[PDB]
Amino acid sequence: MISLNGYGRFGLQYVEDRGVGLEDTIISSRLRINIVGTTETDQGVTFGAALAMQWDDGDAFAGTAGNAAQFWTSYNGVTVSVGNVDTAFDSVALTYASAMGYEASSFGDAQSSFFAYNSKYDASGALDNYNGIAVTYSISGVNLYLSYVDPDQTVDSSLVTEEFGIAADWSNDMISLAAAYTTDAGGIVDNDIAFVGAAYKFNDAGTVGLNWYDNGLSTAGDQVTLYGNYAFGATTVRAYVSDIDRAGADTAYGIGADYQFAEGVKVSGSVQSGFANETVADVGVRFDF
Template sequence: MKKVLFATTALVATAGVAAAEVNFSGYGRFGLGYQEDRTQTTTLTDAGADGVPGTSDDVSYAGTTESDDVILVSRFRLNIDGIAETDGGVRFEGRIRVQADDDGQGEAGTAQLNGARYSVIFGGLRVDAGNIAGSFDNLANYYGYEVGLETFLGQYSGVDYSFATYSSTGAGVNGVFFQYAVGDFAFGASYDQAATITASNHVAPVPPATVGTLDLTEEDGDRWDISATYTFDNITAALAYGRQTDGGSGDDPSLLVFTLGAEFGDFAGTLFVADDNTENTEVDATDGTAYGLSVAYNVGAATTIQFVYGDGSADGDTRNVGIGAHYDLGGGVSLRGGIGQIKEGEADSFVRADFGAQFNF
């Protein structure tokens, strides 16, 4: 859904630059969240036989305990955008984000600062670098109409492939995203790389030394995505393909996604289908077809009703189904909520719901 964010702007004239400004925007949300049989996980780490934490014989133990089904949920997000534009009309942007979320167990979390994203924009061309959103994250109608104050249900729930996403609280992938729009067409591509480091052996320290040694192996990984979008009248079709290499082991995960979105007066809907190949050792659990849909219907001037469904053909895919609603109070403030069922693989399904207020600024 389109978000209108009003900013506080500082303008500074500089030589060779038409204008520079700093914008602040974001939103806050808070309310109650319900999850059937909510649990919390606690992890403890044993230093192993050598008694030194951080070596390859460390052992981690995880246990779960019951938690409150109903908790206070919240988020505060502040975007800080630095913008400059040359006399020739080339726009340069840099963004960082400050975000504070609840911890999922009813406790407040501290605000965190994320990695920076840099952008160059000219006409229909946009290039992002740093903490980017990749081609899938930017794909039209990938997320559809998510349900709930926390947008906890989505049509894409059956996808297991990991693609480049913008991180609100971390450093991000440090990649590059390119998009060019001309007329009704838009083309996109993204790339990022990461090194996977594994330990094959270790040598315990000999007293009085306190630090041992590890034999480490590094494999370079590359991940790239491409996309194409076409809009005709009130219908938008989009296609994206991504692939990831992992240093020559022979298993290259990939994802192919097709989305279709349309608006007809007060009704809007999206369709989603994907071919998901994670190349996991247990491919039956993750590889297959993911599919879903979402719809939104305006009931009067202030109320919007939503429905979403997402699933996949693999044994371990997650199914989402539910309904939600928004009620616009004006001034960027709305009441939001949703209820639905989530089923993760072969596990028992559970009900999740929430309700609260969101204000954009």
């Protein structure tokens, strides 16, 4: 069985003083298509393979290709995946909760380097023999994530640095907790990174949360993000502040709104200020299909 799903997104992307002789405002857009093949068995074991084909404005050669395959096996709530895997630090809950705008960005996101699913090919050739193994599992309302990423599996292992990550999250109906930890993240030796986050649903309509991170060898240092959102019908308002230890950094912040036009259609915008005083703004749509 083969199924196809994905999403399109387009709108305006403003970056104050982008560059000498550059336009600050552009039309940014993304097409994402996923090809999924699955084999269900009567034994209860499911086999799967996924490929992504992603295009973004500005991409080299005005063309689209697929990425590197991901394969998995699922049985009784346990999923083992091989190849281009989702990593633990990139999959836990709460870590991307401050993202806003139609491009889902936030300076409140972790300012570290770590491996994550690769959406596209990489012309530099660095991903050619990259191969990860991942394992996910769910006890009660607990989600467990584990991932092992080998940047070049053909080369003797004593010569390459492997990335290892673990994460768990948990949620009842009002509190959410999450934590992750990865060593040698992004294959950078000694770049050990951590995350702890918690959220409180103080209503059917509002939630506040707080994320803390150890950014490893990044120049950002430790970081804290405080965010909150509130829904008024089909409209959601979101905001966040974030600080990093880097001397002289500014406080980053953002304010945005989401409007659920229809099932599968979402109009979003935001105005954000980064740690180096960058001003960024956006407004556009996402539709899922």
